[PDB]
Amino acid sequence: LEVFSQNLATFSKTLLTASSKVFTQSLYTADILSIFGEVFLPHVMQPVS
Amino acid sequence: IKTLYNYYSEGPSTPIMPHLVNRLRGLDALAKIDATLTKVDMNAAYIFALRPTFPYSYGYKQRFSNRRLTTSAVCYARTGLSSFLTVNKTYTSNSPLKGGSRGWPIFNVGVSPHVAEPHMRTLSPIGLEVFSQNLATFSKTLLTASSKVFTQSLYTADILSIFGEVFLPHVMQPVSNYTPILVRALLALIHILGPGSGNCSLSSSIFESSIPQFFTVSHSTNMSNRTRYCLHTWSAYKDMFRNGIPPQSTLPPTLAPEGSSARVLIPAALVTSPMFPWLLALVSSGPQFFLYSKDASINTVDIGSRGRITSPIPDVANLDLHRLWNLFRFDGHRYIDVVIVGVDRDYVWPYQNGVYVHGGKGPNGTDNYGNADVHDGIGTIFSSFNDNVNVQTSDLILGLLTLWNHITTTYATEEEVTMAIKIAAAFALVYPVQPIVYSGCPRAFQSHTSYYQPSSENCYTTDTAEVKSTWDTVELSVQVNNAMVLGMTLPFGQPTVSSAQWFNNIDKAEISMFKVGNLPLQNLDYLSLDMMEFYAPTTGQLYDIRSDNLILSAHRTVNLGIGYTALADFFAYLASVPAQSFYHDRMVTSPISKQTYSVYERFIERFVDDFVGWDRCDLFNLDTLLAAKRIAGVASSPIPWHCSLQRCPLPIIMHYTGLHFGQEHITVRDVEGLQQIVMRNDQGKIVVDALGTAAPSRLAVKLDWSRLSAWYSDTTCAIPLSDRVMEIINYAAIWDPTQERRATGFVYTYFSPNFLSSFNASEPIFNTSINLTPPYDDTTVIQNLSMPQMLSFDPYYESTFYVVSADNEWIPTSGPAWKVPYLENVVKRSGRRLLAELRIASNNGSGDRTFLDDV
Amino acid sequence: LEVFSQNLATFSKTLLTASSKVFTQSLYTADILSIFGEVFLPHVMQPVS
Amino acid sequence: ADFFAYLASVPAQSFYHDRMVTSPISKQTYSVYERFIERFVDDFVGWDR
Amino acid sequence: LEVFSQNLATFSKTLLTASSKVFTQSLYTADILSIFGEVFLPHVMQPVS
Amino acid sequence: RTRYCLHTWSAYKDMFRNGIPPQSTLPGSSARVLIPAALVTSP
Amino acid sequence: RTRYCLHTWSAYKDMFRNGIPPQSTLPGSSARVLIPAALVTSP
Amino acid sequence: LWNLFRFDGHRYIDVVIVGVDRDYVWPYQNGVYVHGGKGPNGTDNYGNA
């Protein structure tokens, strides 16, 4: 949902609501966010499977 | 709401400008919703957008026809040069070529003193925080949008400092306007591809087979409107303003753009975009490079008078095919500081090798380059624009297609696009000199004329396979070439006095102080701020497919340019503006040219303010009209000044104005509008004694527009092909009592037989297999699309003249006694019909009239 | 229908995500739609046969 | 078509090899045969004549 | 009118932004207005002719 | 006769920059038909 | 007669510190007129 | 009568010309060089006023 907010609205620090760096090399940092926003935009816009 | 049927059904009203402007607005609205631009093939949507065809049905009538078999068909007018054929740069030999001009005109456009009015905009969440910084005393709660999660992005605190330092006016008053760059984009696309009818030379026989697929880039220092570029990173650019203010400083912001010393902020992620070189263009001064067709042999074609298509024109070897891109000169920003934001000290310029960004990577491994080198022209950078570079049409327009896709979707509103289309329509097309054919006078009035012999002017064709029309008697000498080069016009009729000439091994351009128009500058601050996401986007869409794409927009501006040309021709036949007032010798032949220009500009200035909404003097001026020079050894043809500024044929004018010239206005039967004209000589013997009918006054046409319809088909005759004798001369003449010798003939602006043969195809493609032969051909007439004779021969003096019979047995009120043309517009392109005109004898029995009379 | 409701959706460009790829990369890009969606975009916009 | 040719009085010799050299009456008969065919095609087929 | 409503606007000086340039730099500065706005400021304040 | 050019989807994609044009170009290539591999074997 | 001095906007700006004074100085320079380049060519 | 009158106007005038390049040519008198425009011997950015 935060990636959806990134792709839907102009950037703001309040949009970053779920990411964290407490856990290292996990699926919850900002580079995973960039991955989701870069190579999976269709599935962010239309979550379907 | 309205359709082409409704527009073709209705005619002009007594207030013409309130009627013509509304009709043009409705035609533009129709052009908006016309499809045939997205799903169709690439070089068919382009050809439909840039070379629109106007259907029409011709036909002529005769008095005593016995089983006369005629063909009712549909033709497609089209006008406008799609390109220009000149001699190649390495010709020498100083000899004429069949269709090769020694030089081409330059329609130079200046910088408008007016500034496009910007409209309101809203700031991004980061921009609102900069507003809070500039509006309130500092607090840590004011910093609400910035973050350091994303490195070297547009959302950290240094970007905030940039916004607060060099863009404070735009933070306080968020405002933007984008019509200048849209105008330049539309003009660039249209000139690169070429609008019009496909004719690509001073001769009306050579055409362009289709839109070119390959271009070549050529460089010429002498005749290039180049601009200077400097490249910096943001750090070095800011550092160069620390020890005082250097000369030519771009640091202060701009609200009213000024020509020199501009600057643009370009993010690093957008430098690599294909739209960046086109964005540096369309705001700079142009053309910084010349665009040619890669091959002029597989693209140029020849059309005969009968419709014979010969592909290789006789002199393919020594000819270049300039696009309209090389015939236009634009003045924009002359010095641009391209400053890249979010870049370290080893940037490396991506496009051109050997070009180093100030503050970036140095020549040989060094970092933080300390030189702000100035590059002359956009070809020294952007390796795609180097000399002798061969480009495919897709790999050259794509960036443009990208740029227009972004601005019209993210940055600009629909009103800006509409204004851009309306403004760009003024420079959309280029038209050659107007040719005319004087029919002469009947032998009965040989002693009462100053213009007895038939003549022709500006009638040039190069086809040799078929028979050449006798009217075309133009030989392309140097003097004639220059005289016709000084004769091309724009949609509003403005000529140019600037020219270029590249041959032997020398390129030389003469650019006069007078310009054909002016264009507004693009404020680069709006571009920079939009490109850093400082403004909120206008729309969240990604594609302009469903709203104002580049091809549909360009189609709209081409339609509006042809409409401007048609309305200008109509205004010429409203103020009695002669064609000869727009030739090379317009400033010395007669002092009445200024008087005609007064009324013509009165019409144009009312049209522009009522429809375009821009300053009139920026789109049309008398500066180039009044700066005529005359070549030297070029003499004017002995033709009376009786025809207007017709640039497009009659069907286009009727389409854009509602003029009706059908067969209902041709009289066949008959109470006293006749007058006997009597003239005696010094011996008291009557020497004329002929019947005549008074030509209508412009007031009468104003109160009844069918008077103009009847005035046509009373003075109009079909143009003969093999002989210089018309069938109207044997019966009628023009009698002007205020003239010393009171008899004359008809002037009849004349296009070509080859040009009208090109009208047969429904799409402007002619390679080998297109059949341009006339429909149902049986046996010598070149078709009359010429507009009637002017209702007045003086721009200010109102006097009455007559159409006078010449034989004895013809009564002018009984109807014309020759081949009398008639026209219709026709929406649905139908096929050939073989019709028969017969006598009515009360025993006329035909199967169709007997059994097919139900409907 | 997925492609149609996709290209019709409102995005906010922003170089963080891939929506900005229609600007930084040619407008005939397949990183927001699919390759087939990019190819059949004109016909997806006007479905006729 | 044969019935229309009878109705429009179209001779059978207007469709031979010498239809154009014999006498111009062939085109005069075509000028009515075409009307008959055009009406029939515009009333039944619905395609361009 | 842009220049007039500009110089009439309330700012908070603060050396972070450019409004403070009328203090740290001569009061005839063109970093808040434009150069033309700075030049025509007295006449923008009182438009007469 | 008419000219036919046979490719694969992966090979046809690699001809152009990275994707194939929405509108087919001029030169063969005047027309383009996309056939799933399951329909090619049909009579 | 009167004395005329012709400059350009960019060159006229560089005479002073960085901007040109709102009030013209004493010495020529007793009066100043700003003309857009499109109006200079007018008769 | 032009010669019979004497008027007192401005004695010193600065013609500025805004929106022009560094190769500007004075279009009214040969041999007259605009400061910041075309120089005497084809030069650019003329330095003397």
Author numbering:
A (entry chain A), C (entry chain B), E (entry chain B): 197 to 245
B (entry chain A): 70 to 739, 743 to 851, 854 to 929
D (entry chain B): 637 to 685
F (entry chain B), G (entry chain B): 295 to 321, 328 to 343
H (entry chain B): 393 to 441
Paper passage:
The double-stranded (ds)RNA virus Giardia lamblia virus (GLV or Giardiavirus) exclusively infects G. duodenalis. ORF1 expresses a capsid protein (CP) that assembles an icosahedral capsid. The GLV capsid comprises 60 copies of CP dimers named subunits A and B (CP-A and CP-B) in the triangulation number (T) = 1 icosahedral asymmetric unit. The overall structure of the GLV CP shows a typical α-helix-rich α+β fold commonly adopted in the Totiviridae and other icosahedral dsRNA viruses.
